[PDB]
Design a protein around this ligand. Structure first.
Ligand SMILES: *[C@H]1CC[C@@](C)(CC)CC1
Ligand SMILES: *[C@H]1CC[C@@](C)(CC)CC1
Ligand SMILES: [Zn+2]
Ligand SMILES: [Zn+2]
Ligand SMILES: [Zn+2]
Ligand SMILES: [Zn+2]
Lengths: 331, 331
């Protein structure tokens, strides 16, 4: 309630400022950057690209990003700390598990997983001493048996520490409904949970049913769109064919329904991406050259033109992330 | 043809001596030991157990083990080097991919995979400078599309370097037949390939069909048996219900069919095992307290009693591994 853990140590709530709540320095796999840095050109090339991108985001007003890369996204907190220092942008790191856990995770019990998540929140990630400030989980449709354990362990870790949970969904399958059911069965307050990738759907009944019971709604992929690349099957499968304007208008829709305090907005951008097809990063950068600066440079002015106030947008980009991230059992 | 790469540098062929060709210091997942060492008690506890085990194996006559842990078994070559130094046992490290590759590997092309395997053989693993001396691959039944790429890339890496290939099979599904077909389609000599876990089957037609075309036969799980633990479903699923004597007699069978020069024998032991059920290591150590010393302390005397000569067993445990491991396009 007074401090948020970043990769450079605790910061005060007021220090977080304008915060992107779902981003990645690098979307990869555990051990991969260490074993095959040439996949990204070089580790130094990846660092340089990330620092340039974060510096441009800072110039556009961003002060903090939440890197929601887990163990199995290949989160490298030493890389995050290096990039954070060079760009003067706070980075909050994550624990949890995404959609690609290895056997040594997939075989674990709910108690074992809770110990692992608590390790990364309360003690440190690997031998770095850097502590996670958020817990990331994932489903893609109906939860697998192991994913049910992950969601329950995430709830237990959050209940012990006050650190929030943020989720990956297949939004068009309404995953948030089952995620909410499992979280609530463990006693977790919806005020500690962001149901993410929720801008992947236009179903207002699904989105308002989550918001009505107190969940935060992660509209976190605004620039993801393959409009202009129908020839590219893999880019279309990843990014979808809805426009960024269509995604951004969901922010206005939820404001107009009274949920402005529960909206979290982000780009879900990356500076490297080995867990998808080769050269996807080049395709993505062609779609959105602004990178993580897309939200402040393009989405905020778009919503202002559509009649959203500056005050409301400041509440969504500053006040809501601080309330979400500040450790508490009830926000 | 003059040197084998180990985790402590090149060694001469004569230095390898008595060699176990399929072992693991730790069966885990990429990044896992770094992120959650408490799973093994501690990293220091794992090191200590491995050093004690390898020292007892050395006292029984072992001079070299081939650790066939890949990237996705969580191979940590710095751990291997530490254990090798302390126990005075050479350790050959592996490249390749086993049955649990992450997305950042599963999405790669045959050319990309060949670059990665060549990196670990020709340049070094991670930033350690330690070079792999063998390429490990896997199927469990019919090869997945990606596993076909892995087998082809393994063949290409072996054809460029002379380093051999060793495989994981579902032996009762006769995987070696498809593996051989794919290897031969890339032009790889069977003399550079060991079809492993072949002691998991009693099918002599399958085993002699591989040996007849020149493959080495990996009878590498001799002490794996759950005879005595039918109450334990997970141990029975892993270890099977055939006795170690039944597995060991396949060595004699292949000798009696004229294949003594193509047999490779090992324990497929480990000192930690996070990629299976919790406490499996305790169950395994109860079944086989000799660990990696099981082959020299129990299998060699058993075969001598069954009438196999000391000379023949020395050829299988010293001559065959040296011929297999010494880099060449044709052995
Ligand atoms: C933020 C302020 C409230 C409105 C104008 C809705 C009354 C939305 C923008
Ligand atoms: C090794 C020597 C050859 C035999 C005796 C078969 C003639 C097997 C043991
Ligand atoms: Zn996601
Ligand atoms: Zn993401
Ligand atoms: Zn195997
Ligand atoms: Zn093995």
């Amino acid at each position: 309630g007074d401090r948020i853990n970043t990769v450079r140590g605790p910061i005060t709530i007021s220090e977080a400022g304008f915060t992107l709540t779902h981003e990645h320095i690098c979307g990869s796999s555990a051990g991969f950057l260490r074993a095959w840095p040439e996949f990204f050109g070089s580790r130094a090339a990846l660092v340089e690209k990330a620092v340039r991108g974060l510096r441009r985001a800072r110039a556009a007003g961003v002060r903090t990003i939440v890197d929601v890369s887990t163990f199995d996204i290949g989160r490298d907190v030493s890389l995050l700390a290096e990039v954070s220092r060079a760009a003067d942008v706070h980075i909050v790191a994550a624990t949890g598990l995404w959609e690609d856990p290895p056997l040594s995770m997939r075989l674990r019990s709910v108690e074992e997983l809770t110990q692992f998540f608590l390790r990364e929140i309360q003690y440190g990630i690997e031998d770095t001493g850097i502590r996670a400030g958020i817990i990331k989980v994932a489903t893609n449709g109906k939860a697998t048996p192991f994913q049910e354990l992950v969601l329950r362990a995430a709830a237990r870790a959050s209940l012990a520490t006050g650190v929030p949970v943020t989720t990956h969904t297949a939004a068009s399958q309404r995953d948030g409904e089952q995620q909410a059911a499992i979280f609530e069965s463990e006693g977790l307050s919806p005020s500690r949970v962001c149901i993410g990738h929720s801008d992947d759907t236009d179903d207002l009944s699904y989105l308002t049913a989550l918001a009505a019971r107190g969940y935060l709604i992660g509209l976190d992929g605004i620039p993801h769109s393959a409009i202009g690349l129908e020839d590219n099957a893999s880019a279309s499968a990843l990014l979808g064919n809805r426009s960024w304007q269509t995604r951004a208008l969901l922010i206005k829709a939820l404001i107009d329904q009274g949920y402005m305090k529960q909206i979290l907005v982000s780009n879900d951008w990356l500076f490297g991406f080995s867990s998808y097809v080769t050269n996807i990063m080049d395709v993505m950068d062609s779609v959105n050259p602004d990178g993580m600066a897309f939200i402040p440079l393009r989405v905020i002015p778009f919503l202002r033109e559509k009649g959203v106030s500056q005050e409301t947008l400041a509440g969504i980009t500053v006040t809501n992330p601080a309330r979400f991230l500040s450790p508490t059992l009830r926000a």
